[PDB]
Design a binder for this molecule. Sequence first.
Ligand SMILES: O=[N+]([O-])c1cc(NCCCCCCN2C[C@@H](O)[C@H](O)[C@@H](O)[C@@H]2CO)cc(-c2ccncc2)c1
Length: 767
Amino acid sequence: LHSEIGRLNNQSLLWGPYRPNIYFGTRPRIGKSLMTGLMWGKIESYTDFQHTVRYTCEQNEGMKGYGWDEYDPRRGGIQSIHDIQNGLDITTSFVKIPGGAHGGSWAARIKGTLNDDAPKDQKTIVVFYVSQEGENSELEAVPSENEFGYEGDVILKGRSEALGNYKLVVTKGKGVIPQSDHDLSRLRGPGQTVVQSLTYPDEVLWQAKPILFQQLKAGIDWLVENKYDVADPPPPWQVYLLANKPGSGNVHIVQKVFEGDFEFDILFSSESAGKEVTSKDLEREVKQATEVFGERFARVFDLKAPFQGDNYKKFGKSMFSNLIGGIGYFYGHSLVDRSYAPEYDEENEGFWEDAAEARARHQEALEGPYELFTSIPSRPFFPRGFLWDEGFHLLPIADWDIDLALEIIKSWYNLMDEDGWIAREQILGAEARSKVPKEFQTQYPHYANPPTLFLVLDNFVERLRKLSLDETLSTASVDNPEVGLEYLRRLYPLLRRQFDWFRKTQAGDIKSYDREAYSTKEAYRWRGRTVSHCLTSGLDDYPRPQPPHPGELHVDLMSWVGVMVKSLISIGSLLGATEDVEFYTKVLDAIEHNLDDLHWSEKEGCYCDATIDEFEEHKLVCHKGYISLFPFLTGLLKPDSPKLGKLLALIGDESELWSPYGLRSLSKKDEFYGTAENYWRSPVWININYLAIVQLYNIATQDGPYKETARDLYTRLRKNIVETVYRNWEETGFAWEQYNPETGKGQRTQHFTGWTSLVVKIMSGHH
Ligand SMILES: O=[N+]([O-])c1cc(NCCCCCCN2C[C@@H](O)[C@H](O)[C@@H](O)[C@@H]2CO)cc(-c2ccncc2)c1
């Protein structure tokens, strides 16, 4: 049955618009296969289209906004794009139609509606770009009956091992097609849909924009050679219409030119399924997806007071849909330093300098290929897997569809190497590398990242401990406990590998110093830190011991090990791995003690990181902020704990962490408040705030001395965080990376969906 569900999930999730790095396109979860991409741009002159054409996601003054209104990876959804430069409001509806043996069929409707400021007679060029990679596969444009192009639909017929036989149809669409009276029309036609079928070596097919432009340049060169000139030039839109030349190849360019509003459909028909997909199929299946989307949301994301109103419902749908709509499939080689240079051990004072020298050897090389199916923080700026981000992304996603979340976790864990390392930033293939300066591509096998994916596993375990085919499949791994357990059974070794890996590579040093503590074992130090940064912790510029030092201990890291060990206890125990559960219990106990012995400041009333003095003694270094609260944030303290009580005071203290907009990353009293790049040195970040809220609720709904403070802080923090993110969404249309504690303004990057989307689950409550 486990095997059976896997196959059914496989088949359900195969197709999607799994290209979140571009405005609109599709690919299945297969490295070397069939991909599609949308491009459009207005044309007003002989030289503007190169500047106006849209393809890869960006965000600037020319673009008002864009995103998913509704989305489910099993079903499809609807995306709207508001493009200022091109005076266009676009809608891209996509839908999956199950059947056959190759992962079903799909359709999409591209609708462009000019806005009020656009010339009513604007010419918009639209391209649908189709590529296919693989050795033993074919794809061909059925030729037109007409001389110069297509009056009606474009039919591509194709075949591969993975997809079997299929056809892909670009419909004629609705809208005015401009007509040219020029002499050129005798050779190029008056104006009509055109197709160019080309061949490039497979590994460059992703480069759709240069491939298209090469064709346009060549058409223009032909005009020049053939005496079309400035005495009597064809109109721009005809100069930029490709000579129709359909045939065989691994690239197919389908080009339409419209005057005013337009729409057209894409129909993908898997031959092994029943009849081919039609535009009436599309319309109906879109209406149906909306309905199911609506019904699922009201159930899964039932927003509690005071967010039960419609304004917040719309907000929630937008935040949720953008987060789950970010899901992509990535495939290819990564850049990794496999030297394991000894300088990376950071065992001496001044290690950052040695580590730099090693990096300057540039031993990194490409390896793989790898695949990853994951949600992402940022479509415009970094559309790719980030390890601790994903832990946050999947919390709302698991609510929606635990089986999808398990799938994403599985995908991440399949990256893990023999030693137990997963790169914290997954840059898979040349398309992905195009977004990243070469200088920042290289992953380091000694760089950890918070293991927040355990939090998702935690939530699955509690769900395990306590309809349409799609609805069925979404919860199959909880409803069928045998299946849940087999999944955990298979993942459990890699979890332990990771745990062991943290203990081997991220080890702090007690024994070499005047350090005493309940345990000589439990002590941790993030590898990879520089004078100003600690990227691997995820809190980039949060203030840490100065200077960095091999004797550092980091209270956040130990807390994460604490998270992993509690998770190992629950998972081990479901699998009766008795001897390990004994090992885990001994570790947890040592951490609880060593958190106090090594990290607690009775003086400051919070946890602190620790270094080694110029006199070689263990010195606490206290920077009141997120780090300070870690044992609490990660659920490690007893609800009666006096330490927790002092942390509650710090959290609620306005002069320290408590802004009207949420918890400040760093206290206003801290000497480093607002300094440097001020990334994690004051702003309000949603992911840590989410953790505080969850922990306040836990205390609030349980007997103890702080139940009542916890309740007030929960109530208020939930309110401040949600309302801040809502307020900014209402005014700007965006989720932001972080929020200003002075003004409440969203700042840094937009389209951060992204852990800002946690706000949908904060509104939902009932933890
Ligand atoms: O492609 N660009 O044009 C481009 C590339 C990049 N660089 C990508 C570098 C990786 C970001 C990590 C964020 N990061 C922060 C950490 O603090 C979290 O802990 C960490 O996990 C998350 C992970 O999301 C930035 C911009 C940009 C543009 C305009 N405005 C602002 C920024 C644009």
